[PDB]
Enzyme design. Structure first.
Site, PDB file in Angstrom:
ATOM      1  N   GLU A 123     -12.237  28.059  15.160  1.00  0.00           N
ATOM      2  CA  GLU A 123     -13.406  28.297  14.314  1.00  0.00           C
ATOM      3  C   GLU A 123     -13.139  27.656  12.940  1.00  0.00           C
ATOM      4  O   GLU A 123     -14.064  27.396  12.180  1.00  0.00           O
ATOM      5  CB  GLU A 123     -13.705  29.803  14.201  1.00  0.00           C
ATOM      6  CG  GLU A 123     -14.335  30.383  15.455  1.00  0.00           C
ATOM      7  CD  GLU A 123     -15.810  30.094  15.689  1.00  0.00           C
ATOM      8  OE1 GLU A 123     -16.546  29.859  14.701  1.00  0.00           O
ATOM      9  OE2 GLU A 123     -16.238  30.147  16.865  1.00  0.00           O
ATOM     10  N   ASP A 124     -11.874  27.361  12.653  1.00  0.00           N
ATOM     11  CA  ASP A 124     -11.443  26.763  11.392  1.00  0.00           C
ATOM     12  C   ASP A 124     -11.793  25.290  11.384  1.00  0.00           C
ATOM     13  O   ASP A 124     -11.587  24.607  12.394  1.00  0.00           O
ATOM     14  CB  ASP A 124      -9.934  26.987  11.186  1.00  0.00           C
ATOM     15  CG  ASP A 124      -9.398  26.312   9.949  1.00  0.00           C
ATOM     16  OD1 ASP A 124      -9.482  26.925   8.850  1.00  0.00           O
ATOM     17  OD2 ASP A 124      -8.921  25.161  10.065  1.00  0.00           O
ATOM     18  N   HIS A 125     -12.337  24.813  10.249  1.00  0.00           N
ATOM     19  CA  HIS A 125     -12.779  23.426  10.053  1.00  0.00           C
ATOM     20  C   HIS A 125     -11.704  22.372  10.309  1.00  0.00           C
ATOM     21  O   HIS A 125     -11.935  21.502  11.145  1.00  0.00           O
ATOM     22  CB  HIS A 125     -13.467  23.241   8.680  1.00  0.00           C
ATOM     23  CG  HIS A 125     -13.908  21.834   8.395  1.00  0.00           C
ATOM     24  ND1 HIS A 125     -15.136  21.357   8.835  1.00  0.00           N
ATOM     25  CD2 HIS A 125     -13.262  20.841   7.736  1.00  0.00           C
ATOM     26  CE1 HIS A 125     -15.202  20.099   8.422  1.00  0.00           C
ATOM     27  NE2 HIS A 125     -14.095  19.742   7.758  1.00  0.00           N
TER      28      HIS A 125
END
Length: 138
Positions: A123-125
């Site tokens: 979910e982290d960019h």
DNA sequence: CCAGCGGCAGC
DNA sequence: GCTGCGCGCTGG
């Protein structure tokens, strides 16, 4: 077998994957903190606390002094001591089982420390940039 | 000058 | 599923 490749994104995980404790500490340093500020402080931390063995014996109030300019200094200092204790003393297969490591640290571990990148949905960019790049380049 | 922003636990 | 924790950075 397994060696995560270097990427154009230069995630800090690419340099730390040989030592899962260092990689996981780096994730904690990045919690709601920009890397531009967290990473220089991470090197200061690793010089003073080079291992989980030293970190678990630290007084969180001293760790907190180093963490001051990053914010969340008391919270993460207490986390670092407890996590380092669990890393060494608890039986674990995935670091999510350990206090202070959630989805981000766990997704990091599964892409870099073990060969499970194909099973991970970050979910982290930055992790998504690296993970998307891995699928495209194999 | 200025406000929005860069995980995890505990409950 | 909601809330505490927290600084300096960043864009205008």
């Amino acid at each position: 077998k397994w060696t995560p490749p270097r990427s154009p994104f230069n995630l800090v995980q690419e340099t730390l994957f040989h030592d899962p404790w260092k990689l996981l500490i780096a994730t904690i340093f990045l919690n709601r903190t920009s890397g531009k500020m967290a990473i220089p402080v991470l090197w200061k931390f690793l010089e003073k606390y080079p291992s989980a063995e030293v970190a678990r014996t630290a007084d969180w109030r001293d760790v907190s002094e180093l963490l001051k300019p990053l914010g969340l200094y008391d919270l993460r200092a207490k986390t670092i001591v407890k996590f380092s204790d669990e890393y060494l003393t608890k039986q674990w297969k995935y670091p999510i089982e350990l206090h202070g490591i959630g989805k981000y640290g766990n997704d990091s571990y599964r892409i870099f420390c073990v060969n499970e990148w194909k099973q991970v949905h970050p979910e982290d960019h930055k992790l998504n940039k690296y993970h998307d790049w891995l699928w495209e380049n194999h």
